[PDB]
Symmetry: C3
């Protein structure tokens, strides 16, 4: 069935170009706003570029010294900064040291959960998360008359003490951090650093004056987020330095520079905050007197997490070509909307109810014309599909229901606008010669109500029964037909059926399923007799 | 060529509305399942919301003490936890310390790769990854009769010793970790913490009883993943605490709370595992006797990586509007499928082979009707395009092939259903007056097989040759044509060609490329003579 | 208005199948390249699989020892590696130690910013980021005649000293790192490790010979990126070990193995580099003589960041089904292009200018035929819409403009190809009986230029005025119409208007808005008189 002809064939939809100005306004508005929006998305979001995330690597150095008044001591970088290499770094701003701790037995600190009245109160080997040593069955005196359960631990047990305010290293707001950041785009093959040639180191980052100096003062970091460093220093906190690398690697429009933002990554430290701060414990272990002692320090400080994010984009053909396709179909949505306004405003319900009431959508009656000139109604050509027309009526009843042993005259069907026997009402219908219930189909009168027949009209005589016009139509199809055979009379009879069907039913597909009235059918059979045998019924082409 | 009329014009496709119930079933099923699926994707995946990832910041504190039996010592937080600030934290559960190491020369430990028979076996300066000191040319006795190559290193060299089982700090399953987690959505501007007001600290996380208490017991973490802490503690491992923040920031339906999950990020520790555990080495450096010594500790423990992931979504108009478009086109796929079932079930191969065999798809013959009423066949109007019809046949041969100096009577063409000279077979065809090979086109007889001609039929006389009907048709187009000029006879002749072409070829576009038989053409020319000059050939409109 | 019939109805577009070979070539080329491309995207990018990122966990151990010549000492793993657990690890390759530092007062190192001429130069309590101690008002002699401001700090203050070249631990290129990496796909439930059973540990990673051995020599890592380890070791650097896990978890085609790549994450160390290296400071605190001293070490080394990335994919039905839809519409773009080539090449401007000049796109004239057989022009049926035809002309003027009190004869309209009073030019037009300005519409002559009328032609007499043909047409619609009533004469008159409108205007929708000439209208009214009252005007159906 296939051929080079079937291969080389193009399908294009039949369209009807409506000249409606209103529809033109709507269509152009939709297309313009979709184009204006999608063109923006392309320019603003750089959807024409292939984009790659940064591969960052941060190195931080804190400079500054603090005079701690605990005797006065001096704290350098090696004293307050802890070995956090990478994105985050820590700056201790407060501490509580319990020095000289040695592994031995000692009375517990008088916490409310450690007081005893006798040795019966304290258990042996008992441990709980708030306990700083394994309890012993004895309850020793701590000091004076205070009796606390004795434990084996690093002694003296560190006191339950509030964080010392003001912060011992509240000078930490004067410390500066240099942040060296290298980004790499491997797919785009572009490496760069936030430190540029000719960079003064005496600078300090300022949001406007010096936005590209990577030496940030900690106090300025805190005052750029509306935080109080003095309050945060006492108990600690978490702060965050965002570095945003928005880079386009096009040589025409090239810019790949960092943008520094600051954001507290912790709950605000208020007077009634719930479990605030950032503290941990670490110990310095030293051997003296041939015994190992430790200095236990509870460190409260600010942890600065450095969050380097960004993207580097370079122009790519493939990305633009896909985005194009996506934006190209959006324009089509305009048609769907208007096609709906055509289908909805074509319904008879619009004219029945809404038009007489609103009276504002009255000139929207042309949608019936548009729908008539756009959509065509076609019914499944099932065998049960039939059509019946009566003279007294102006509409054709589609008989879609298979006859339940009832005369087709009585059978009711769906109305369609046009493009003697008991059932007979004209007086000229003859009884059906068809057997079984097949006769039901042929039991059809020319009109529903009693009155004059249709075959009595001279139009039926000189149009359907006229041998001249039928013979002329036969010659038209076959210019050399043999007219002396009884098959000529049979073809004459077939044409009379098809002309009554087309004369009465305007459409050809509607006349394909025509069933003629008994009066007209038998008048035709008399005018064009077959004596070979029984006449055949209506037979559906499908 | 452009006009405000061209600007304001709408294109809508012509459609034919099929009333097929089967096609309606298929279309509605497709639309319903696409709508039901896409509505789900919207509700389930929250595709109507703009979603942002969390910006987390974890702070962990481990509480608990262990009685290590190595002499009995006590290990606090500062003793087993190592300075890992951030997501991960480490809890030492085993160790091997080689204390008192001093920088000097010593015999190597008797590893199989360090035994010597004499000083010739050991090289000077030799180093390999399993060597713990630079070898010296001498081979000193370690102990008794064991001779091992002498090295310069921290001495005594740490023994190659198995991890001490049971774990020295197997009490570490009783330790609790508080995890403080703050998430931030900057675009949505929403900050929150996993610790809520009114949080008892005596709680411990339970999967059902207390799911929101952020104090996790390590043994419970391990038993919630079916791990044996006692086996993992001996050699170490890696564990992972996932915190899932699924948040929707809509005030109507607001919930942003963590969900804690546990997952071992390490290979299961079996009896025959390959290189299991998690250990490292670190040294404590102390100066005594004015010389620097170090305690080298091989630490085996569990590293808990805290993996905070999630998304916070808030309702956005733009996201819903794009998703709508995507889901809106899926419905259209229903038409493609049915349109195919129409195009496929219309082919003659369906009736030729499949219908007589299967006999089940017999009522699917209406697809031929649907295809006839939907698709129209149109052929390229190239100059070579021609049409030839013979009386004895019922189909028209499209002559698409340019004539290779052969009479058009002999030329064969593709069949199309209808909507004396050697080549002559009727006896009335006259020789072509056309010159060169142009005559070939005009060398065409009314019929393929010998027999009666077509011009002898009275229909050709009173339809094509009839001056009355031709003159009437001319008056129809021009109601005031001058009938006394020879141009009237020329227009009469042109109409006779066009009527024979339309009488014989039903379609107008098929009659545009008609080539009349020589007999009919010359009969027309005789009935409507031109004596001014030679008659013109068939000339294609394109 | 709704019915089970409206529910079960299918919309299919009317298409015209063009047999153009050129259009077939273009359509098949577009479809083939779209299919060939989208099939590739599916195979290459594995778009048919659901893909999940890895959940990695890296553990690193460095082996190797260095002979440092500072007296000769030996550095083990515990000496050069710093407590960096996780992805990154650090290997010290150089240092500068200032040992024996004690908290006291000392002269500042003679930096250019610390020299004084007297105690007036140095301030008390002054601090700046390059200062290593709080200044005191006194200016003490450092050595000889060098006078430097005295400070309180850890003394002696560390000298401003260049990094010692060659690197003290330049043997660090001989160190090996074992990297243990476990990936987990939770959604796909697949866990694996880069260390396989039967793995020799004597191996060292080689790009080709031994690509899966996870023991990397640092010198080889540097020589695989074209770096000089000896130069990098002196001042430090940042290096990166990428581990790529491209896994497909389909049992048929299963492969999940790592791929090791190396990339320097730092600026190249040249002779004139800007702020190169990677160094920090840390202190060892020891108590001797009952006083606390510290050894301050400036460590220069290489930080190796381990970047584990990858994806594991498994076949998913839903992902393939969505991708299908996206690729399925791309094919449709072929039609849009050709439909445009049809619409563009149909314009008259193509034939007017481009065709006579280029002469190469001459056979592209068939696009006019395609457009004629594809697109149909329809005009809004507004009440103001009118049509006027004159005998002397061959085109119909659409009068879309509402008449401004001017005779319709004078009014000009847009030309459309066909499918006595002052305004009168025929001499037979009668004055309008219509009142107000409504007469303007009826003031229309049969022709624009003076000459013979149209009603004098016998065709108008025997077609429009002929009572026989009009009566026959009336009988056709109603085979039993009463012909003896004056309503028969009124229907005769209505049919004469509609036939003149259809005889003159070919289209039915164009004849719906016809306005007849005054001569023909009044001739019809005389031939079919109404004496009941005034005759009505042209009234628009909409
Ligand atoms: N926190 C800081 N505040 C101000 N300047 C700084 C800071 N950290 C480093 N610098 C300066 O930046 C320059 C380059 O820094 P870098 O640390 O790489 O070199 P450096 O010689 O090792 O620095 P230094 O020895 O002073 O710690 C140096 O001149 C250093 O003085
Ligand atoms: N691992 C843990 N197990 C149980 N409770 C804990 C743990 N870590 C902290 N807590 C309790 O949680 C509360 C808040 O913790 P947070 O550390 O911020 O305050 P804190 O006073 O510094 O804690 P602490 O001094 O007891 O270490 C404290 O009351 C503390 O006792
Ligand atoms: N950097 C390295 N170079 C070479 N081999 C190594 C390195 N690190 C570990 N190995 C070897 O890999 C094997 C498994 O490593 P793993 O550390 O898990 O076991 P281990 O017994 O604790 O190793 P070790 O005690 O030798 O440090 C061991 O046999 C070890 O010798
Ligand atoms: N449209 C239509 N066709 C009919 C009707 N009755 C019969 N036919 C057609 O006419 C044919 C039978 O005609 P018939 O009277 O038997 O004459 P014969 O076929 O020459 O013997 C069948 O093929 C039918 O398709 C009718 O009521 N309406
Ligand atoms: N359809 C069709 N048209 C023809 C044929 N032969 C000639 N014509 C048309 O008739 C015209 C030539 O007619 P001709 O005999 O020369 O009469 P003349 O044009 O008045 O001199 C040309 O324009 C052709 O388009 C034919 O076989 N078929
Ligand atoms: N197409 C067209 N229709 C017309 C014209 N003039 C009148 N009509 C129609 O003819 C009808 C009026 O005819 P009229 O002379 O009053 O006869 P009557 O309706 O029987 O009284 C109206 O319904 C109009 O639609 C015209 O110029 N062109
Ligand atoms: C920070 O420095 C300024 C000037 O150097 C000084 O006035 C201020 O007191 C310092 N802050 C603290 C907390 O010491
Ligand atoms: C990246 O760019 C450098 C400089 O042009 C070039 O030497 C190198 O080969 C490039 N790498 C790739 C992967 O193309
Ligand atoms: C850096 O800036 C400071 C600002 O006071 C200036 O004094 C100094 O000279 C600058 N250094 C250089 C190298 O420009
Ligand atoms: C900052 O904190 C300090 C000490 O807590 C307090 O004295 C001061 O008033 C605070 N400043 C502001 C602006 O709240
Ligand atoms: C953990 O604690 C429970 C009760 O506090 C105790 O019975 C158990 O022995 C402890 N586990 C270890 C390993 O010490
Ligand atoms: C975030 O919310 C707070 C509280 O309403 C408001 O003060 C702040 O300005 C907001 N930030 C932004 C970026 O809108
Ligand atoms: C916390 O829970 C424990 C459970 O035993 C209870 O004893 C204790 O009183 C609770 N504390 C508070 C503050 O509710
Ligand atoms: C857990 O490990 C210990 C020591 O390795 C062993 O005695 C015990 O049976 C193990 N428990 C289970 C459930 O395997
Ligand atoms: C690295 O080892 C090789 C052979 O073991 C040796 O020749 C070379 O000198 C070593 N490199 C350094 C910097 O010591
Ligand atoms: C993952 O696979 C293992 C082995 O088949 C199975 O025991 C376990 O239940 C699976 N987990 C899930 C979430 O299906
Ligand atoms: C590992 O490879 C080395 C290569 O020299 C070889 O000598 C050694 O025997 C191998 N070990 C094993 C267990 O195969
Ligand atoms: C590597 O560095 C060393 C010392 O800086 C130098 O002697 C040697 O020439 C360098 N090698 C190369 C290939 O540049
Ligand atoms: Zn009857
Ligand atoms: Zn009847
Ligand atoms: Zn012939
Ligand atoms: Zn012939
Ligand atoms: Zn006139
Ligand atoms: Zn006139």
């Amino acid at each position: 069935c296939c051929s080079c002809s079937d291969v080389f064939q193009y399908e294009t939809n039949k369209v009807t170009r409506i000249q409606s100005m209103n529809y033109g306004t709507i269509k152009w508005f939709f297309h313009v706003i979709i184009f204006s929006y999608v063109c923006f998305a392309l320019v603003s979001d750089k959807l024409y570029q292939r984009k790659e995330p940064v591969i960052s690597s941060v190195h931080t150095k804190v400079k500054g010294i603090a005079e701690v008044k605990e005797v006065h001591s001096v704290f350098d970088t090696a004293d307050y900064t802890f070995p956090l290499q990478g994105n985050s770094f820590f700056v201790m701003t407060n501490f509580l040291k319990t020095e000289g701790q040695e592994q031995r037995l000692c009375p517990e600190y008088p916490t409310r959960r450690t007081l005893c009245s006798s040795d019966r109160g304290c258990k042996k080997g008992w441990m709980d998360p708030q306990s700083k040593g394994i309890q012993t069955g004895r309850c020793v005196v701590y000091e004076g008359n205070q009796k606390t359960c004795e434990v084996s631990a690093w002694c003296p047990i560190e006191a339950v003490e509030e964080a010392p305010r003001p912060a011992l290293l509240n000078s930490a707001e004067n410390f500066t951090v240099l942040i060296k950041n290298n980004i790499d785009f491997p797919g785009h093959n572009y490496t760069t650093r936030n430190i540029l040639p000719g960079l003064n180191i005496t600078c300090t980052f300022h949001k406007t004056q010096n936005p590209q100096c990577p030496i940030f003062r900690l106090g300025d970091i805190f005052r750029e987020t509306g935080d109080n460093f003095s309050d945060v220093a006492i108990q600690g906190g978490i702060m965050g330095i965002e570095i945003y690398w928005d880079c386009n690697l096009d040589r025409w429009f090239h810019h790949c520079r960092p943008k520094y933002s600051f954001r507290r990554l912790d709950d605000k430290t208020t007077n009634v905050s719930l479990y605030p701060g950032y503290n941990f414990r670490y110990a310095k272990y030293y051997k003296e007197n041939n015994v190992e002692k430790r200095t236990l320090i509870k460190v409260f400080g600010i942890r600065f997490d450095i969050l380097v994010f960004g993207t580097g984009g370079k122009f790519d053909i493939i990305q633009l070509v896909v985005y194009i396709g996506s934006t190209l179909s959006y324009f089509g949505l305009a048609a769907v909307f208007i096609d709906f306004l055509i289908d909805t405003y074509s319904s008879n319900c619009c004219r029945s109810h809404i038009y007489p009431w609103c009276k504002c959508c009255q000139p929207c009656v042309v949608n019936e014309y548009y729908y008539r000139k756009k959509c065509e109604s076609i019914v499944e050509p099932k065998p049960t599909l039939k059509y019946v027309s009566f003279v007294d009526e102006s509409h054709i009843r589609m008989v879609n229901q298979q006859l339940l042993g009832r005369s087709l005259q009585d059978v009711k069907g769906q109305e369609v606008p046009r493009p003697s026997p008991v059932w007979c009402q004209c007086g000229s219908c003859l009884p059906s010669q068809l057997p079984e219930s097949h006769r039901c189909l042929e039991e059809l009168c020319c009109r529903k109500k009693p009155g004059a027949c249709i075959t009595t009209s001279e139009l039926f005589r000189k149009l359907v029964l006229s041998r001249h016009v039928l013979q002329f139509l036969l010659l038209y199809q076959e210019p050399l037909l043999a007219l002396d055979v009884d098959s000529t009379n049979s073809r004459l009879r077939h044409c009379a059926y098809r002309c009554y069907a087309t004369w009465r039913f305007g459409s050809q597909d509607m006349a394909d399923f025509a069933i003629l009235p008994s009066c007209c059918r038998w008048r035709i059979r008399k005018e064009f007799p077959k004596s070979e045998g029984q006449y055949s019924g209506f037979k559906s082409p499908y």
